[PDB]
Every structure is written in C-alpha cells, then in structure tokens.
Amino acid sequence: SGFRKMAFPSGKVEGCMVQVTCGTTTLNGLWLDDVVYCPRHVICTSEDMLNPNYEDLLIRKSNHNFLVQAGNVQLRVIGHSMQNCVLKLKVDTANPKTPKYKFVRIQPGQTFSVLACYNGSPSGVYQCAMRPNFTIKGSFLNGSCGSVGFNIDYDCVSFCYMHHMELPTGVHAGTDLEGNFYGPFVDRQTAQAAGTDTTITVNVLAWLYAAVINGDRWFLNRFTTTLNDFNLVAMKYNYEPLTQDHVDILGPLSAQTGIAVLDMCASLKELLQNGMNGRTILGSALLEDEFTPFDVVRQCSGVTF
Amino acid sequence: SGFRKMAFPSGKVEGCMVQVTCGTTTLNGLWLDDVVYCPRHVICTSEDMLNPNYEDLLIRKSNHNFLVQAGNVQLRVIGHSMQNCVLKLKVDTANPKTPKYKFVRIQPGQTFSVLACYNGSPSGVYQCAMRPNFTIKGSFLNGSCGSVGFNIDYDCVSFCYMHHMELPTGVHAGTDLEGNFYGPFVDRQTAQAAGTDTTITVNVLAWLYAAVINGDRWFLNRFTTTLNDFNLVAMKYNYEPLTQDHVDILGPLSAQTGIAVLDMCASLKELLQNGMNGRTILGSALLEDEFTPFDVVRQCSGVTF
Numbered sequence A, B: 001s002g003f004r005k006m007a008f009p010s011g012k013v014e015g016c017m018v019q020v021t022c023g024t025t026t027l028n029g030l031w032l033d034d035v036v037y038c039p040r041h042v043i044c045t046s047e048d049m050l051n052p053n054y055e056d057l058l059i060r061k062s063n064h065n066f067l068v069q070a071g072n073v074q075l076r077v078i079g080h081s082m083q084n085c086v087l088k089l090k091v092d093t094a095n096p097k098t099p100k101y102k103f104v105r106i107q108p109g110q111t112f113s114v115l116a117c118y119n120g121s122p123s124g125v126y127q128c129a130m131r132p133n134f135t136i137k138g139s140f141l142n143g144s145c146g147s148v149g150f151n152i153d154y155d156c157v158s159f160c161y162m163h164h165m166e167l168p169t170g171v172h173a174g175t176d177l178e179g180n181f182y183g184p185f186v187d188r189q190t191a192q193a194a195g196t197d198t199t200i201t202v203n204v205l206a207w208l209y210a211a212v213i214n215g216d217r218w219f220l221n222r223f224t225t226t227l228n229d230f231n232l233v234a235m236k237y238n239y240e241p242l243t244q245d246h247v248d249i250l251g252p253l254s255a256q257t258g259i260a261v262l263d264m265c266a267s268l269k270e271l272l273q274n275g276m277n278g279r280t281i282l283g284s285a286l287l288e289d290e291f292t293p294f295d296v297v298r299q300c301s302g303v304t305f
C-alpha cells in the first residue's frame, strides 16, 4: 500500500539523449534509429527570438553546423529537415540503444513522465499532467529544451512531449514529436495567452478511489448525486465537465471499491463545497488531479515494463 | 523555473535488478559485480513469518535452491551468506551493467529515490525521505521487497535502502545494504511500534527558499525570530529542533535569496501558528518536508549525472 506520484523508469529514454549545438546554443536532442530530434530554436540567436524567421535561419545552416554528441562520441550529420517546430538531423549511425517506440499526441488531462536533461545528460525524472489548457507545470531551467515526456507500455516507449518554452507566467509549453505545439503557442519569446485552466475531474475522482483503496475513508459520505447536479457544481469550481466516457473509465475502480461513481462524485461535491477542514488525503491538503484512472490501476496493481 | 518532486534517473539501477526465487517466494535482488543482494525473508514460508529462525531456515538451503534470473538469463549461484537481514548470493558472472557504486547508511531526514520493482522488473520511480522515526512513506505492493533506494553523485550510485516490510500501520521499513534495519524494526510479521514522528524542519525551510526562488512570495513577513524562540514553536508543532548545523547548510539558499535564515524561520513560525488561509505554496496546501537543502540547490541549479 501507499500512493506516490510515480514516474516511469527512465533508463530506456536516458540512452536516447544527446547534446545538440548550433553556434552558441546548446540544448538536448532525442536520438532514435538514425534521426536526432530537437527544438528548432537551437538555430536562433538573441537577436532572433522576438520573431525568428526559422526558414531563413535554417537556410544559412549546413549539416556540418549541427554538432551532435552522445556522451563522449560525436555523431556525423548527413541531412537536416525542419518539420513544424522540430529539427530532424539524419545521422550516419543508428542509436544502438533505441528502444521500441511510438510517437503519440496525447490528450489534455493525460499524464506522462519527463526526463529533465541538460547538455544531453539526464538530471531527474518526474510525473506530470498535460493541463486542460495544454500547458505543463514542470521544472525546467535554461538548457532543458529538448527534454522529452513519455509513457511506457511493456517494452514500448510512447514519446508524447518535447520541451520548448517557458512562458512569462512560469508555465511550460512544448510540442509532440512531429513538432506541433500543444495549445496555441508559438516558439517566440513573447507574452502568449494560455487561456483558462481547469481541474481534471476524472483524475480527481481516480485519486479519491486510490485514497479509499489505501485507507483514507474519512471523506466518504451518506450522499449521492446526478451527473447534471455534479456538473453544475463542477462548473462553479472550474472543474472539467464529467461525461459518461469518464464514468466508464472509472468503472474498474468503482468495481474494486464497491463505491458507485456517482456516490464518489457526491463525496467530491462535498469536498468542493466544504473544503477539507484541515484534513489530508494521501498526504495532500488539496484535491490532486495528476493521476489518471489508468495510473491508479497500475500503481495499485503493480504493472512492470 | 518550477519545482517538482524529482527522482534521480533510474537507468543505472534498472540494469542491476534481478528476480530471486527460493521455494514459492519471489522477490527482487540487486546484482552488483558478482554478488546479488536481497532480503533474507525470501527463505520464509507463511508458517515462518511470526518469528522465523533465519539461521535454521538458511541451513536447509543450498546454492542451487536460490533461483536468480536477470531478464531472461539465469545466473549460477556459487555461494551464499547471510549478513544481518540480507542474503548475499555469490554468482559466477559479474554484472556487465554494474555502475560505479557505494553503500551508504543515510541519516533521518535525508532523501533518496526508490525504484519500485516486481519480479525483477522496474515499475516506477519516486522520491521520498527517511522519516525521523526511520520509516518511509512509500508505494509498495507485495512482491516489491528487494526494491532499493539510492542517490546519484555524478557517475556514482550510492545505495542506501533495501525494502523489507510493510508495518500494520501501512508505513514501510527496510535496511541499508549491509542488512541493518533503519529504526527498531525486525523482519517478522508483527505489530511493531515506530514511535513518534516529526516534521523535518530544515527541509521545510529549504522548500520555503525554493518557493521564493520560483516566485511564491506571499508568506514572507515583516518578522524575525531567534533559534530558541523558533525551537519553542517547533516543539509545539512536532517539528525537529533546528541547530546551527542546519542554519549552516541553509547558507547557500539564504545567500541566493537574500533572506536570512532566522527571517525565514519567522515566516515558518507564522505559517505554523496561522495555517495557510487556503493559499498554496509550490502547488501544495501543506508544509512540504521531503526536499533537503541540497535537493533544492540541485533542482534550482540543474546538476546532471
């Protein structure tokens, strides 16, 4: 028992991290097969960053301008291409450490692990969620660009995120591995509206189930509710609307605990309306929304990779 | 910017995990050089667990009774020895994936990363602290025994924890890698008092510094205090006493922020006496004590391994 904000083991991804240098700029790249993926703003200078013309900047670059280093060994760049906001550098050696992998574009509310890297070397790993407004609340310093987010399913790494930018608000923005930003964001050093964020309701409910499984019981009440009544409350507290698809994905946790989903919604309603009276749930004094129902089932069933 | 509960990258440790089977019992082992380390209770049966006579149980075992498997490959056991509460199985092959490593016995209040494993396969990684009462608040299911805790300093893994037991209270207990339990605990399936726990004061202060560095400012006040006055408050709220050694290790964070340690103590005093009035600090509505001052400096300075 016990419940922790658990990340995926990072070894499969550590073996794919490289350093990419273009001019004075160094950031991280992802080496899979014979391609290295990195943010295209590696080709910018400080004069460039308010509104870089990436096409013009890249035209001035040749294969030999991209310095790619994996630990101590230098990789030979034999082609380069810009896809959306990422650069793809073809190298003459396939990464011997390439795992089975997929590129996926995740949905808001889904979670993933981030391997924070600097100069191609991993620094740490942590779990987070893609916010409903397509930002992430990460821990990134300058030089972390090109760090990636991922999930693992048995032997397959699904890469879903590459880090590009810290907004002036201190939240983080990035792309899928085809270089498409999540959210409205562009790779320019400008103020950029993220728009209203909300709490991921289905994840809060999953975490309340995790709490019950692990012995925090005190918030269970004598009440039930309806999906309409609950969603009127959700709207008032800037929670995402709950759908039947969400109720369905919570089914396994309902079955394990014997607590119907709408009964758990009624417990959440009371917590929203009354707060926690200085109590805690799973070591938290707020309602946690960074565990999906599938995260709770894995951590509670001990799935390995 | 941003601040996360970050674990060390786990790849170096993943390559050391094996499965150890003795009879019907399977748990995890740690393969370093030509020795596999695992909890000695792998040799118990359910009849045994209220008070196992480990010496008598081990005398009935031979090298060929210990089944050790690294992924798909079987290891050949050529010796066995019990050291305190761990078994050391000498194997005929050195682990080709052995990192540079040390065994360390950590102090209460220090933090480390746990690689939770089942059947020798890693499941997830998370950061935690050794409580002042020598328990840990982990996430462990049956079969996780033998999972290890560790820190990394450049290329060297310092192993500090091996998981043995879940107490009836749902908290966790284990040993250093010489098999000595942290705390008063014994490897028997019994109720065992953990004794009074306390909050790790120097870590809470480090985290308040991390908050200031990252822009949470609201709890800073016009006040200061003394070490005596503060420690009278610490005692009332079951916080560890603060010493000058703690003030000294907080020096770098004081210097970075310009906030004297005793001024930050006065902010913490007011939070303890008044609560947070429904506010949050770094995404938390409680005072977080699982970051050491050295954790905060790394995460804020971007150290890699």
Ligand SMILES: CCN(Cc1ccoc1)C(=O)Cn1nnc2ccccc21
Pocket (backbone or CB within 6 Å): A041, A044, A049, A140, A141, A142, A143, A144, A145, A164, A165, A166, A167, A186, A187, A188, A189, B001
């Ligand atoms: C310098 C590049 N830009 C802006 C940019 C320019 C073009 O496209 C995006 C970043 O925001 C890089 N970045 N990413 N995470 C960070 C965390 C702390 C400090 C900087 C950080």
Ligand SMILES: CCN(Cc1ccoc1)C(=O)Cn1nnc2ccccc21
Pocket (backbone or CB within 6 Å): A001, B041, B044, B049, B140, B141, B142, B143, B144, B145, B164, B165, B166, B167, B186, B187, B188, B189
């Ligand atoms: C079965 C062995 N014992 C008791 C024991 C017997 C001898 O020495 C210790 C454990 O508590 C194993 N254990 N460790 N973490 C757990 C988490 C959930 C369930 C069981 C768990």
